[PDB]
Design an enzyme around this catalytic site. Structure first.
Site, mmCIF file in Angstrom:
data_model
loop_
_atom_site.group_PDB
_atom_site.id
_atom_site.type_symbol
_atom_site.label_atom_id
_atom_site.label_comp_id
_atom_site.label_asym_id
_atom_site.label_seq_id
_atom_site.Cartn_x
_atom_site.Cartn_y
_atom_site.Cartn_z
ATOM 1 N N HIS A 22 0.804 -1.234 0.000
ATOM 2 C CA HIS A 22 0.000 0.000 0.000
ATOM 3 C C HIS A 22 0.855 1.312 0.000
ATOM 4 O O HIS A 22 0.333 2.420 -0.231
ATOM 5 C CB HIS A 22 -1.119 -0.056 1.077
ATOM 6 N N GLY A 49 1.693 6.053 10.443
ATOM 7 C CA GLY A 49 3.127 5.948 10.052
ATOM 8 C C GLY A 49 3.809 4.675 10.591
ATOM 9 O O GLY A 49 4.952 4.373 10.225
ATOM 10 N N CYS A 52 2.858 1.532 9.782
ATOM 11 C CA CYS A 52 2.836 0.377 8.883
ATOM 12 C C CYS A 52 4.246 -0.052 8.548
ATOM 13 O O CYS A 52 5.180 0.780 8.486
ATOM 14 C CB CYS A 52 2.066 0.692 7.587
#
EC number: 3.4.19.12
Lengths: 302, 300
Positions: free
Chosen positions: A41, A143, A145
């Site tokens: 992503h 932030g 991920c």
């Protein structure tokens, strides 16, 4: 003595964390040897995440669309590919801090440590369980991920989780290091929600064993139960059905304490039926289910 | 989302852990630059440390770092620690400071056995100067610390378990926290209290995270708060504590004494089946600094 929610030391995993940026999106990556793994992503625009086609979005990128940095130092990308919900970025240098490692897919009810990171830098380490419903009750801000979950056996890091998403209830969803989601979740904005969850019965039993090893037996009683009768009670309290395999896993702790597995199940039944009566176990006022049998054996005295 | 007790990343400390063996006693040491620090009891009812250390030569101390034996070239005692000089400066030495923490303050502990890190957890120095650690035989010399940016502030070295199964140790100058001594005595933990400063910090954490059902329209004086909270075995709140909570009070716009009124009502009335940050209990092992650090997403 004592009993704490303990994580594995995080140094082996700290030396693998990098930052990956595509367009205006930054998140964390994991740098092992000459490859950086991160959530796919990262390639998605403000919009794309509503109905992304990752093959169509990726083919539009080159190696030089990806900025990977260890600290302030750029690592040049010399190749890329997608594997399920992860990107694999080949870089032109190897990470000499790569530990011995394996990628493993854990089962619901198992525990692992999470090293929470932002912009490729560690913020904190904590221990959690993968819920029966495949979510984790994490602590993650925007932030995070790409942050990873892991266990360590001797000097080998078994990576089991990479963080992808926060669900509407504020619990967390993610993938193994092959990019396969735990649970029915997808990496797009949809109406997806955490499914029903249960209490991890095997872990609650392990923890009651911890309490006995540590010297406390107040919650024990003179009764035993069959597995069937135990389940008939526990299932009414939203507990995961207990199997003979789970009974067999508790054998070592049973032998250490001299309390038969089924006699500990009888104690649990009574605690569920009568409550804790203002008392504590291992300092807790609630039954704890985030320690596996292996966690108890590792942490408690023999 | 989420609130978890989190420990600092432990890697900078892991690179400092070594094993120290004297005869049949092995414990952990902390290797910074060319000095290894460990509990002086490694050389051991009524120990005569000064006299016992006389009989020790440098060669008596076997110091191992991973698979590498570190040659000891000097030794001395500093309060309840040994300082062993070794012939190699630790290449992994981080920026560091030694600090003495105050009661109620938190730190991460890296539990170590045979010089090998086994786990990391967060804990508080209890008002009774003990820690509710998790430690088995061989843990001694394990250390507690905090980190600021790149700098490890070491604050605890583990020495002993007390009869209730709580733990006592020293700062990195070798001075005990509390009245404890490194001998077999009848010493015991005294009565302990709940760390009010930290419970308030945690209520501010809850508000920052949108969990605010417990706030009310009222306030209290400090004395009236202390009159109530001291009945529930809470530590007396001082004006100094009120000021330490200034940044959280400013961020939330909730005056400390108004939070105290909320806390009084929770102690007197309970939670009525409700949760705060997912907890059924009032948490006391997060400091005002832990809260800002977690809610502001600070990294190291």
């Amino acid at each position: 003595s004592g009993f704490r929610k303990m994580a594995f030391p995080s140094g082996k995993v700290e030396g693998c964390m990098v930052q990956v940026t595509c367009g205006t999106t930054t998140l964390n990556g994991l740098w092992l040897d000459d490859t950086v793994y991160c959530p796919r992503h990262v390639i998605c625009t403000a919009e794309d995440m509503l109905n992304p086609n990752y093959e169509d979005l990726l083919i539009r990128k080159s190696n030089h669309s990806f900025l990977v940095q260890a600290g302030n130092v750029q690592l040049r990308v010399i190749g890329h590919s997608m594997q399920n919900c992860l990107l694999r970025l080949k870089v032109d240098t190897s990470n000499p801090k790569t530990p011995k490692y394996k990628f493993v897919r854990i089962q619901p009810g198992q525990t692992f440590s999470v090293l929470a990171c932002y912009n490729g830098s560690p913020s904190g380490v904590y221990q959690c369980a993968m819920r029966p419903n495949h979510t984790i009750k994490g602590s993650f801000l925007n932030g995070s991920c790409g942050s990873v979950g892991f266990n360590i056996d001797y000097d080998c890091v078994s990576f089991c989780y990479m963080h992808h998403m926060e669900l509407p209830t504020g619990v967390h969803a993610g993938t193994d290091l092959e990019g396969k989601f735990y649970g029915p979740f997808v990496d797009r904005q949809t109406a997806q929600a955490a499914g029903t969850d249960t209490t991890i019965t095997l872990n609650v039993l392990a923890w009651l064993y911890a309490a006995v090893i540590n010297g406390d037996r107040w919650f024990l009683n003179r009764f035993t139960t069959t597995l069937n009768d135990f389940n008939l009670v526990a299932m009414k309290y939203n507990y995961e059905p207990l199997t003979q395999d789970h009974v067999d896993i508790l054998g070592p702790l049973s032998a250490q304490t001299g309390i038969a597995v089924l006699d500990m199940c009888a104690a649990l039944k009574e605690l569920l039926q009568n409550g804790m009566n203002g008392r504590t176990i291992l300092g807790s006022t609630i039954l704890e289910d985030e320690f596996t049998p292996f966690d108890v054996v590792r942490q408690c005295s023999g």
